[PDB]
Amino acid sequence: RFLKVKNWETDVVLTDTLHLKSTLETGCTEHICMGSIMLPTKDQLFPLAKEFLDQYYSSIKRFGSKAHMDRLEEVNKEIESTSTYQLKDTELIYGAKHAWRNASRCVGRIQWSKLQVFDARDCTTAHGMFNYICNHVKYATNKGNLRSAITIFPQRTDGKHDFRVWNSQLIRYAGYKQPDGSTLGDPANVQFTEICIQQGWKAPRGRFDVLPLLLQANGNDPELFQIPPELVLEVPIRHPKFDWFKDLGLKWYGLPAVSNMLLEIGGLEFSACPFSGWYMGTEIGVRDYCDNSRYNILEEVAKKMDLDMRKTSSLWKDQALVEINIAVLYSFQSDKVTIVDHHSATESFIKHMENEYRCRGGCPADWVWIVPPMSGSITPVFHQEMLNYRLTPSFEYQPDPWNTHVW
Amino acid sequence: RFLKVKNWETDVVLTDTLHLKSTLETGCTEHICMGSIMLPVRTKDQLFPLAKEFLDQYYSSIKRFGSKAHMDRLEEVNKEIESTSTYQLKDTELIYGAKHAWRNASRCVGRIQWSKLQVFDARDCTTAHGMFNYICNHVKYATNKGNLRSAITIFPQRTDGKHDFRVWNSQLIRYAGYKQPDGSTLGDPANVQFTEICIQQGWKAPRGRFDVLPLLLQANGNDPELFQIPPELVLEVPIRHPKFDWFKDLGLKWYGLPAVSNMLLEIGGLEFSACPFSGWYMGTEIGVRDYCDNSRYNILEEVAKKMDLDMRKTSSLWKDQALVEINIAVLYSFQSDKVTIVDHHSATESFIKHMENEYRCRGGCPADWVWIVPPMSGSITPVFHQEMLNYRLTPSFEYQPDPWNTHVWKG
Numbered sequence: 155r156f157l158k159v160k161n162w163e164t165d166v167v168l169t170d171t172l173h174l175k176s177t178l179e180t181g182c183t184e185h186i187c188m189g190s191i192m193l194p195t196k197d198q199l200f201p202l203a204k205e206f207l208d209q210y211y212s213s214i215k216r217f218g219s220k221a222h223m224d225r226l227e228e229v230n231k232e233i234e235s236t237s238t239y240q241l242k243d244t245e246l247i248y249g250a251k252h253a254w255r256n257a258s259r260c261v262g263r264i265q266w267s268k269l270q271v272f273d274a275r276d277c278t279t280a281h282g283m284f285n286y287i288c289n290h291v292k293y294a295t296n297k298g299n300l301r302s303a304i305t306i307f308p309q310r311t312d313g314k315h316d317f318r319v320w321n322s323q324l325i326r327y328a329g330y331k332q333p334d335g336s337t338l339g340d341p342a343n344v345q346f347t348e349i350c351i352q353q354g355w356k357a358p359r360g361r362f363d364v365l366p367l368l369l370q371a372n373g374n375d376p377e378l379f380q381i382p383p384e385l386v387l388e389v390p391i392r393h394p395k396f397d398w399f400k401d402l403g404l405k406w407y408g409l410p411a412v413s414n415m416l417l418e419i420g421g422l423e424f425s426a427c428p429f430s431g432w433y434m435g436t437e438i439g440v441r442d443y444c445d446n447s448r449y450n451i452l453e454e455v456a457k458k459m460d461l462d463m464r465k466t467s468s469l470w471k472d473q474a475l476v477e478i479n480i481a482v483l484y485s486f487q488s489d490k491v492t493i494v495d496h497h498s499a500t501e502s503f504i505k506h507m508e509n510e511y512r513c514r515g516g517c518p519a520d521w522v523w524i525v526p527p528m529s530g531s532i533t534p535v536f537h538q539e540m541l542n543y544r545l546t547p548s549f550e551y552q553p554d555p556w557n558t559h560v561w
Numbered sequence: 562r563f564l565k566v567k568n569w570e571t572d573v574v575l576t577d578t579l580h581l582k583s584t585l586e587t588g589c590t591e592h593i594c595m596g597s598i599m600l601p602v603r604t605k606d607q608l609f610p611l612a613k614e615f616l617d618q619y620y621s622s623i624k625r626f627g628s629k630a631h632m633d634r635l636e637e638v639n640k641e642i643e644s645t646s647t648y649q650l651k652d653t654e655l656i657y658g659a660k661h662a663w664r665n666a667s668r669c670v671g672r673i674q675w676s677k678l679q680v681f682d683a684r685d686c687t688t689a690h691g692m693f694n695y696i697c698n699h700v701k702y703a704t705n706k707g708n709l710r711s712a713i714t715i716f717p718q719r720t721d722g723k724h725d726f727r728v729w730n731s732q733l734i735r736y737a738g739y740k741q742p743d744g745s746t747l748g749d750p751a752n753v754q755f756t757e758i759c760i761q762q763g764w765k766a767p768r769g770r771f772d773v774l775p776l777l778l779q780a781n782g783n784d785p786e787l788f789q790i791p792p793e794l795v796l797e798v799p800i801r802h803p804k805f806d807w808f809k810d811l812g813l814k815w816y817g818l819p820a821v822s823n824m825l826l827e828i829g830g831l832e833f834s835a836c837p838f839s840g841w842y843m844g845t846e847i848g849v850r851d852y853c854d855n856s857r858y859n860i861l862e863e864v865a866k867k868m869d870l871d872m873r874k875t876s877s878l879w880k881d882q883a884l885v886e887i888n889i890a891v892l893y894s895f896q897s898d899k900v901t902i903v904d905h906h907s908a909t910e911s912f913i914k915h916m917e918n919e920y921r922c923r924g925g926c927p928a929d930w931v932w933i934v935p936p937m938s939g940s941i942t943p944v945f946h947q948e949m950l951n952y953r954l955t956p957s958f959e960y961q962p963d964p965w966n967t968h969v970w971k972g
């Protein structure tokens with residue numbers, strides 16, 4: 155019931171007590187582990203609200219205070235009469251910060267307490283959402299000195315009036331098919347790009363076209379908006395050795411901003427809650443550039459380096475992978491746009507873990523996601539046992555709106 | 562109940578029914594996943610159903626389920642258990658069992674080869690000297706002058722727990738580690754403790770960076786005895802790099818035969834505590850883990866310096882750069898010396914095919930993602946994008962405590 159996690163590089167052992175507060179389920183059973191699967195009412199709501207308020211008031215050293223009891227009081231009254239309740243700003247911010255703190259797949263959580271929270275619960279229209287999102291992008295981007303942020307739109311009422319950002323990220327590149335049968339741009343966004351087209355986007359059928367926002371306010375049909383170019387900070391990718399690298403014509407954006415997730419706090423659901431931090435270099439160079447079903451530029455780079463691509467055993471893929479990632483880090487650092495390498499990030503995360511074990515009694519962590527997609531075992535997290543479990547407040551996946559939307 | 566795993570590169574979806582035949586616990590619960598945790602005397606009582614289960618499996622595989630031969634065998638095993646509190650496996654069952662423990666080994670990326678396993682039956686063995694001879698023959702057979710063949714040698718099963726056969730080495734072939742008084746380590750830091758035991762047991766240590774350890778062998782629960790593997794049987798490979806000539810001057814070499822000697826093989830309820838097995842190396846086991854782990858030989862810095870990389874900030878990716886050249890070196894050296902080795906691209910690609918073949922013909926393939934994904938360049942291998950289910954089937958290989966922690970010393 156009290157569990158130990160060992161680091162096999164340092165023999166450091168930590169004891170987890172925090173998992174005993176876990177409420178949600180993992181997909182795993184005692185007969186089967188699903189650790190590598192990507193996705194495994196008034197009476198319902200009051201316990202949830204209670205669990206949250208209890209931990210909020212505990213966090214501000216006022217557990218069992220009259221203020222605490224009064225709040226539980228007031229919230230229960232509100233639920234019974236209204237079937238829902240509203241968070242005070244202090245609770246909202248605490249909840250958002252803790253949803254990040256509890257995000258077991260996020261390596262950047264050492265930063266969790268410095269989140270800037272934008273309260274957009276007063277928003278009513280897609281133009282309103284657009285304004286808030288532009289403000290978020292500009293704040294977070296900060297001319298390249300990135301700052302973590304979340305913007306929180308109104309909570310779900312009866313599920314017929316949901317606020318949704320249809321984009322998976324605020325800033326992504328379009329993807330179009332060709333009669334050539336190949337794929338132009340980012341293959342990840344082919345389907346979303348088409349929904350932009352059918353809704354009326356005028357695509358400039360290029361390779362790196364910043365997608366428009368598709369914004370749904372109050373269960374209404376979603377609308378298109380172009381993010382002001384001047385707010386989208388982009389980075390041309392060059393190598394600090396290979397002059398020919400720039401001729402590949404690669405660029406990437408500075409702001410990584412997840413916008414399709416669901417923020418759950420005290421039983422309330424915030425279906426539109428885009429958030430951003432800053433890039434770990436591998437996200438771009440390993441995943442975005444080298445994944446087969448993404449930009450998949452390995453062979454092209456490999457040829458330009460004149461590598462022996464006859465046999466896999468020359469490790470030409472590995473050699474090219476490294477240089478691409480060198481270039482990404484270099485390009486971002488040169489243009490003074492915040493970025494972290496996987497060595498520094500994972501080093502920070504081990505520090506955060508030990509802090510969390512020390513000051514909270516544990517830290518949920520999904521090893522499959524925390525270990526970087528290159529050079530796994532030369533980063534300290536590889537050797538770190540981790541326990542994965544779900545705490546609330548939380549960020550949850552939710553279905554794509556185009557499968558659900560009653561047009 | 563059916564379970565689907567998806568490959569996120571190819572969108573190939575597979576369906577697992579095999580997990581239903583899983584009995585053993587995983588460590589995980591509905592509330593916690595222990596997928597990244599490394600490690601999360603049997604009565605006649607529990608023994609017959611374990612025997613029956615195994616023999617039902619055996620007889621299904623040979624298309625003789627429910628046959629008279631099947632029924633007579635259950636009867637025979639039942640009677641033997643009831644009167645002797647245990648039983649002996651036929652040779653055919655042993656072979657079937659060992660192959661299937663390999664097949665079920667969820668952490669082994671090499672399982673495409675599972676049906677090709679030379680099984681050596683050493684159940685007639687009674688002494689440490691006898692064990693040494695059997696292990697010598699295994700090393701010679703498996704090495705095959707560089708053309709490696711998978712093999713396993715099976716010593717007699719556990720009886721009362723007081724007469725265990727054990728190989729105290731973790732691998733048949735490994736280099737000594739020596740803690741120096743200044744806190745540094747000469748040789749392989751992983752084997753410091755075992756090296757000390759050996760020395761205590763009377764081993765005369767040459768005290769160099771690459772000393773092949775002696776075998777420490779326990780027969781029938783007696784105190785273990787030291788033997789030296791004949792050097793001529795230990796195939797080694799000097800590490801050089803195809804383009805960097807200073808690389809050979811690092812003085813590196815490795816042995817060619819990877820052989821695990823400390824696991825327990827469970828078949829039909831019987832426990833085989835000494836069952837050393839060997840395959841061949843995936844290059845990253847040596848180049849990534851053995852050389853570049855901070856807690857092992859740890860040569861990244863020295864390699865990096867000699868390459869004149871920018872080592873001032875990690876963001877130069879000097880570590881990733883040195884790591885790659887070292888792994889190129891390991892592959893180059895082994896191929897050049899005609900010693901069997903597989904790169905992680907080839908091995909993972911084959912595993913995906915194996916795994917897909919297993920879903921069709923078998924209804925599943927238990928796999929541990931945390932272990933199947935290679936310790937470098939993970940996402941440019943197909944396994945990274947492959948959802949996998951982990952569960953425990955028998956026959957199986959299991960961990961067991963190190964024998965120096967449990968052994969009752971005779972004198």
Ligand code: HEM
Pocket residue numbers: 250254257259260261262263265269302303304429430431432433434437494499523549
């Ligand atoms: C500030 C620097 C940050 C860094 C370096 C960072 C790093 C990462 C990385 C590398 C991933 C893996 C994503 C993938 O491979 O798809 C991730 C996922 C995630 N991050 Fe962060 N992050 C940061 C900020 C944030 C913030 C501000 C939040 C929320 C307030 C957050 C919440 C999450 C969540 C919920 C996931 C899981 C996403 C999923 O399941 O697809 N992160 N993070």
Ligand code: HEM
Pocket residue numbers: 659663666668669670671672674678711712713821824838839840841842843846903908932958
């Ligand atoms: C023939 C080529 C083989 C290859 C390329 C191969 C590859 C591997 C690799 C890379 C690992 C991970 C080891 C680690 O990181 O500690 C492993 C583990 C394992 N393999 Fe193999 N293997 C082969 C043969 C075999 C054979 C012949 C057996 C048994 C009959 C076997 C059973 C296992 C088991 C039980 C493990 C898990 C060991 C542990 O948990 O420490 N493999 N294999």
Ligand SMILES: Fc1cccc(C[C@H]2C[C@@H]2NCCc2ccnc(-n3ccnc3)n2)c1
Pocket residue numbers: 192193260262323410411412429430431432
């Ligand atoms: F389960 C899935 C199946 C298919 C696609 C998927 C999308 C998952 C990969 C994306 N996860 C977020 C990636 C991302 C992008 C931009 N920024 C961040 N980000 C920002 C701060 N922290 C993370 N993360 C899930």
Ligand SMILES: Fc1cccc(C[C@H]2C[C@@H]2NCCc2ccnc(-n3ccnc3)n2)c1
Pocket residue numbers: 162599600669671732819820821838839840841
């Ligand atoms: F749970 C643990 C905690 C700390 C160390 C540990 C040892 C792991 C490394 C051993 N795994 C086997 C390594 C190995 C060596 C030589 N050959 C093979 N090999 C041969 C065929 N298949 C694998 N494997 C476990």
Ligand SMILES: C[C@H](O)[C@H](O)[C@H]1CNc2nc(N)[nH]c(=O)c2N1
Pocket residue numbers: 189190191192522523524569945946947948949
């Ligand atoms: C199938 C497997 O779970 C999947 O490929 C995961 C592996 N680990 C990951 N890790 C991160 N950070 N991001 C990912 O998208 C994935 N994908």
Ligand SMILES: C[C@H](O)[C@H](O)[C@H]1CNc2nc(N)[nH]c(=O)c2N1
Pocket residue numbers: 162536537538539540596597598599931932933
């Ligand atoms: C903590 C973590 O489970 C541990 O370091 C694992 C990670 N994956 C591994 N994978 C392989 N093949 N071998 C290992 O020793 C490990 N170690």
Ligand SMILES: [Zn+2]
Pocket residue numbers: 182186187188189589593594595596
């Ligand atoms: Zn699990």
